[PDB]
RNA sequence: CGAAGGUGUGCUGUGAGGCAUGCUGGAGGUAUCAGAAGUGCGAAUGCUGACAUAAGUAACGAUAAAGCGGGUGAAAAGCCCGCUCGCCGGAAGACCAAGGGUUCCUGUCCAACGUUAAUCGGGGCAGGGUGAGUCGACCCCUAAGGCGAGGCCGAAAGGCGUAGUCGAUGGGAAACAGGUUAAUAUUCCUGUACUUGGUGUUACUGCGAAGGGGGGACGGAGAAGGCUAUGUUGGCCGGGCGACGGUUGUCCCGGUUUAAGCGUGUAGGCUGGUUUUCCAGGCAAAUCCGGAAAAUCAAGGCUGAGGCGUGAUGACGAGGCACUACGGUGCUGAAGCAACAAAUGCCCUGCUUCCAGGAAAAGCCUCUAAGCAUCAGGUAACAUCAAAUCGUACCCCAAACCG
RNA sequence: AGGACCGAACCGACUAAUGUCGAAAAAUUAGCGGAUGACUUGUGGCUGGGGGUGAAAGGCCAAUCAAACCGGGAGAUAGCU
RNA sequence: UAAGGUGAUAUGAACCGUUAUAACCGGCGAUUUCCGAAUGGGGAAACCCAGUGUGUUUCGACACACUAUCAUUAACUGAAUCCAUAGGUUAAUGAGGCGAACCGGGGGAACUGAAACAUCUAAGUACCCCGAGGAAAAGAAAUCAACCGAGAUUCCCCCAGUAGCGGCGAGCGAACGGGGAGCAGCCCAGAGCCUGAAUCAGUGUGUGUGUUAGUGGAAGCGUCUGGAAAGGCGCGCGAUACAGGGUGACAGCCCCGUACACAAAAAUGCACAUGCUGUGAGCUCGAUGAGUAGGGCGGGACACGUGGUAUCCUGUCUGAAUA
């Protein structure tokens, strides 16, 4: 199973999460 | 383990062949697919031995 | 030959969702990712040698890829391919 | 008022389509430019 | 133990600038004399990036119109449930075709967008969703048109065109009812079927074409008849008698639906049939078409909606009953009839007239040529196999298409 | 039967008003002419730039037409700003 | 080569091997889906539809190879008329397209200058097509020169802004000759003597040399500041290596490296010896290039633009001699 995606570090104006 | 079937003839590595394609490559995808494969290098060193086994074929088979 | 290669390599992997359960329990139905060609008359064949059951019929349908966006790089996912497998009244799995 | 362009699909393949263009001795000229300058799409297509 | 750039100061020369230093800075700079400059910017409606200005001003994008009770939430007029008011309703409704490509459903958040907030969305992330022998594409044929073996022409490129090949905007075979998910259904489930070919059995038989004949195969305008979809009333079924007068009554509310296939084949329209003999015609032949003769009856033959029974003592069905993650799920289920009117939709590519005289080919029925007729092939019935591949969500008079 | 009449959809914009840094780089409302044809439209192709088409206005040829757009001659030349 | 790796964004999970088949690089091989000259037919690109021959679990349906055009050669059929040809069928070899510039040829302008503009210049430049090569073209005078003499072509410097051409305007602009780079000469049109006789092209062996993997390769510390020292001070060593990169501030002696010495199982480019196949030395005589030279008509290039216009070519009409 692969959960992680590595999400990468975003942009200053980035969705909350 | 690459100059062990070298010396195999025809039939025989077809037979093994046969028996890497039925076995540890389709249970191990379906594991994969439902979570219950816990080791993937199985997969890699399975594939390596199917085209192993399909390049001597085709070096003693026909040339 | 190369039929029985051909058949144990269409099967890709199965399939899981709500839609696949509900089939499964009412409908006698698995769905299962195949090859990109994968035709229904190769799907069958190798399902009957596999799984060593009686399928009535098998319908399959293609998946369009999704669009997605990683960081600013947007990209589509590979398009799959799902069947339906109908089993008989005698089912196993 | 009906813009210019409507779209269709089949009219753009027949017209800018890369058989199209390999049709005529130009339009492989301009295919050859098109592959020099290294634009990703040689030609428009599905 | 502090270069350059940046940031102030005191001196210095007629001056471009030079010197040292307060603070950030952090590892680069460079004496004097010569060598070369993309070597000094203040304007060229000079170009690129940022910021003033008008200014917290116009405007916030058809004058169809919102409110209230409850719910989540920190924030409620715009998010969700319920009751009112209003708009479209030949559409501002439902299907599609072209065009977009997951915008469709669920979970999850307000980083950016919605000309305001928004917990909301056609927004961000994750998951799910597209089931075809009968839908369309695909495939057979082809019109306009394109390509074009040979060939003609042209300095070359290239232009034209035959046999042929592409080219649906057209012609060819088949499915309907109900039910289901949060998203598919004429694809899934229940029932009834239908169509094209392969295989094997049974009884017969002459089969056999890029060739011939029929059909495919067609304009405009207009009237009537039968119909149907559809709607009105009545009867029947279940309920009601009711917060402001009366309402067991000629009263009110809701239902009163059922397909494709199968057999009968009607209304209507078309056409005279049966048999024999012959013919340099149909670029060969022909039992096929056409033409010429006769004997016979006058009816036959073709097409043909709709209705009627099977489909179907099946589904559906108002309403009630039991639980609700309080959105919703399970059981049940009475009647399911008559008349009228009726269409632009069917009989009808029908019928009557008019000049503007109203495609082609393939599938389809028939004839034989070459060759074979102990075969093969075809016919009629039966059983079986296959009918692959592609789109199947969503918008489609719009927020999703072109602007 | 009517290149017939009134009049819906459909075609066009003849008049008025608003819109000119508008909702729209010619738009909206009511009137307005045709609405069986010399009508319109969906689809599929042909006519390509001294050329095409044009019931003909020097009109249209993708918001550009008394000679389109794209790259080159080309940094054309300018007794001019 | 080898004890670090399973490529990066980009961590993680699970594994491989550590003295050799962990990982990486190189030489030779196998697979190499579809479109793309696409080449079985078609088509809207990654798609659809097939025929033939070889072998096969349920007839079912599968796997492999072939199935385009032209040119040349070979064979079999084959009419309008006997023959025959045309045409048709099959077997074998070559091409079909993609490439920045350079080369030759067939085409081929305008802007602009002359202060206008038509001759001209721009210019055989912009640009199109064809063909092939690594260079291509050209090349051994029916040449020059001057009656003195040089003997292949090509490239650089003078002659050269000279003589000349040019509405003698703009502007264009050589040649003989001199100095340098490099120097090779042949073959057919035809017979006799001798006939591997020299030089070359095609394939093996050996030697030499270079690449595709790489290896060995010298030497500094203590102290002070300073986060960290390679920096201040002290005393040392190597150097055929202080050429360079990184190392908590500037490193010859910290690492990678450099000078210098080595390395190749396999394939390789080039210089030779040794082999096999192929054309082919030297001597005697003859021959020595015909629709061509030239000319009439109109042009193009030669600095030469038709002028007194020499020279070569070409569209049409003519057209000899040959030593």
Same mark, same amino acid.
């Given at each position: ?17 | ?14 037979n093994?062949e046969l028996l890497?394609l ?42 | ?15 899981? =969702?709500?839609?696949? =359960?509900?089939?499964?329990?009412? =409908? ?49 996912? =590979? ?15 | ?46």
């Amino acid at each position: 199973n692969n959960r992680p995606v590595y999400i990468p570090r975003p942009r200053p104006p980035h969705p909350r999460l | 383990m690459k100059a062990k079937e070298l010396r195999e003839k025809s039939v025989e590595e077809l037979n093994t062949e046969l028996l890497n394609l039925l076995r540890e490559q389709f249970n191990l995808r379906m594991q994969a697919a439902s979570g219950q494969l816990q080791q993937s290098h199985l997969l890699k060193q399975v594939r390596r031995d199917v085209a192993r086994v399909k390049t001597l074929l085709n070096e003693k088979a026909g040339a | 030959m190369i039929r029985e290669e051909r058949l144990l390599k269409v099967l890709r992997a199965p399939h899981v =969702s709500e839609k696949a =359960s509900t089939a499964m329990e009412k =409908s006698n139905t698995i769905v299962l990712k195949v090859a990109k060609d994968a035709t229904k008359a190769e799907i069958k064949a190798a399902v009957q040698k596999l799984f060593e059951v009686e399928v009535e019929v098998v319908n399959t349908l293609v998946v369009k890829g999704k669009v997605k966006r990683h960081g600013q790089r947007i990209g589509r996912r =590979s398009d799959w391919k799902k069947a339906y497998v109908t089993l008989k009244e005698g089912q196993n799995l | 008022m009906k813009r210019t362009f409507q779209p269709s699909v089949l009219k753009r393949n027949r017209s800018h389509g890369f058989r199209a263009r390999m049709a005529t001795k130009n339009g492989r000229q301009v295919l050859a430019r098109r592959r020099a300058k290294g634009r990703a799409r040689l030609t428009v297509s599905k």
